Design a protein around this ligand. Sequence first.
Ligand SMILES: [Mg+2]
Ligand SMILES: [Mg+2]
Ligand SMILES: [Zn+2]
Ligand SMILES: [Zn+2]
Lengths: 97, 74, 55, 57, 79, 126
Amino acid sequence: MLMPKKNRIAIYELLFKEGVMVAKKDVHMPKHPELADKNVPNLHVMKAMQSLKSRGYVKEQFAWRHFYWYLTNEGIQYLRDYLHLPPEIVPATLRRS
Amino acid sequence: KKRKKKSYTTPKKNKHKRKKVKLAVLKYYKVDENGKISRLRRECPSDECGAGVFMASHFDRHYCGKCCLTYCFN
Amino acid sequence: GHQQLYWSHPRKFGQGSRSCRVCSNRHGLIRKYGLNMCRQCFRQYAKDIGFIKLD
Amino acid sequence: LRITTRKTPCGEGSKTWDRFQMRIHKRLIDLHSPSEIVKQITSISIEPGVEVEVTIA
Amino acid sequence: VQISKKRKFVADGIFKAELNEFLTRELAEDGYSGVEVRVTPTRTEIIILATRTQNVLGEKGRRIRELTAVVQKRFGFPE
Amino acid sequence: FRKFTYRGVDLDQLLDMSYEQLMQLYSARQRRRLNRGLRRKQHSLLKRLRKAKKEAPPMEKPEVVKTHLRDMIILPEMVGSMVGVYNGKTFNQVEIKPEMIGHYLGEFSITYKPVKHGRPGIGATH
RNA sequence: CAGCCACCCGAGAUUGAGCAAUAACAGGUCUGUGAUGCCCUUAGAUGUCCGGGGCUGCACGCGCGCUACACUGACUGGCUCAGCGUGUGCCUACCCUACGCCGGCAGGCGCGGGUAACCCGUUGAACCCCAUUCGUGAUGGGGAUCGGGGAUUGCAAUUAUUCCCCAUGAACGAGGAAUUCCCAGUAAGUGCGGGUCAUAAGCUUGCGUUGAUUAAGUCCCUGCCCUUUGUACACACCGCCCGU
RNA sequence: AGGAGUGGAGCCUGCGGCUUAAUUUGACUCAACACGGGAAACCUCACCCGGCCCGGACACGGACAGGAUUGACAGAUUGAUA
Ligand SMILES: [Mg+2]
Ligand SMILES: [Mg+2]
Ligand SMILES: [Zn+2]
Ligand SMILES: [Zn+2]
């Protein structure tokens, strides 16, 4: 989609921050609840996430009007390059244990 | 189930094609021979519309394009 | 502009403002007790919800 | 809680209805105790499915 | 605020149903059989019964953590 | 025969009256509608009607302005205006006459063709 | 014997539902679904918003129903009894209402309670009961149709959402051939709740309230089971098959 | 055996026919026809007349520091502050 660069950037920092992202399948709600205060429409989240899935960077699941996306290793590398993060920065899902 | 056959209502509305203009030379005017740039267009008086943005000059009125602020010639 | 027109019709009370929380359909919806599911989805999930047949 | 629905996913056939049911049972216990002893009694690994609410009058 | 007992029970049944459906769609390949929700003070334990527990957990637990986060994000439990 | 009169008051005072005074002459409904307020695109139609009336040459009818709105027939400000009301597929031409005050535009653009019956066929009587 | 009938004692001597086999139907549903395979379409789109129409349109035919044709009734006052239950919402706007005041009314304005055995509520239901006027006729039966006003919900009420008032006052005098459902707190009268619901029940799903006539049987009608019997059927009588 | 009926009236509703720009359509014996929880003003919505939008991922080539995105006014809307 045509979206502002800051919107895609914020979506990517969220996704890299916890490695997962959920979103209601509703193109008309004006603010993503997690991405509020940054003015990111839910439609932008869904379309950016589908772009990443098509490129093979996330895995998507759907159940009861909700998308769930999990970051893949190739997605982790791509997002690290895209946001320029230090190699030692890793998503929350890879931590603990 | 039949075809639209909507040839009665218009012959396909043309979409808009933006005319290609080369550069923003007409906005600034150094050419003072003494490196004195003169701005050939007004600038906007809005907060988020500082020195960078300018305002168009039609046959009348001044128009911003960013905040859509208009000052008629009068 | 399209920004002010897209989805501009008020949707606050009618059947166009309610839908199934499972399948997003708008027909045969059960609003009682806050279920907000259509009849068929309710028959599908009734045992999971806790509604069981006695009489 | 009662919900009566048509059995069919369509509108065909003899009109049969499912009569679903949920039953909520409610118990009240009043006791004279300090709050610490009440906390000791309440947290005794109660059986799952039972909601317990302790209120101070 | 607070809601009625009827609505609260219907709501937690709805939550259980949606959770079970999502877990089915996610872990059918790993022998998913059911989910048990245990509510304790300030904690909610979700027990997933599966034949292949290692596949459900994933390597170093990664998969399970993902699931937890997803639940955390979907049903709005406190972080 | 006699000059037009609406609820006892005639054309000129109807023009000279405000909306608050209109609500008294109007019936229940067309009073609720005015009290709730004429929204936009009703003022747009009113101002288009005003412009068409003003630009009209002397002794000649105003040009017909077309609209989708089943709107109030407001005080004679709309009387004499030539309006094409959309019926669903056509803009039917209607001239606003003083007796039409207090009515809806849709009352003058019928949305269906009146039925002229044909011979029964097929399983009319099983 | 299996059991059947009657009677005593007894709260009760058959409460009502739910679930329900083998096997089958080219029964219904792709219009419930992020259930679906194949086609079709996919940017002047069969995707999706947004105006306006429609879905109601009316010579006529056919189903389910509501209100009646009155006096075992209408009207007007008076009196006095329920049960099932639902109430403030993820998105989500929209709850149930006591009390005070204003207005015939429908309503309006202030104030509180209630997330409910806590408030509405002691749910002051209707029929029914008591008294009144009418007086056998389309009558004060009955309320279709239609006019003029007033409110409410909504973003818009016109093709009239709903409600109120005053007017208007149609057929209908118990219904032909032909048919439905019913065995006891039952049929039938009578209201009340839930669903639908911004606005809303002549529908449906439940609840009480008043409360019977008749029957305790039979294959006569209608089916549907068997059993014996016949078949040239076996895609099974919507079969098979003969001749010009 | 009977009870309440209805088939007759008026109205309300569903179905056919007729009509229509369109009157979206599924389901015609029991086993369709106050059924699709189907009481449609908008929405719903499928149908008809008009008009915006892409919410045409991604891969491969073009174009590109100007690819492309909004937009106030007047026209125009053969309805609109599209
Ligand atoms: Mg027989
Ligand atoms: Mg043979
Ligand atoms: Zn500016
Ligand atoms: Zn559903």
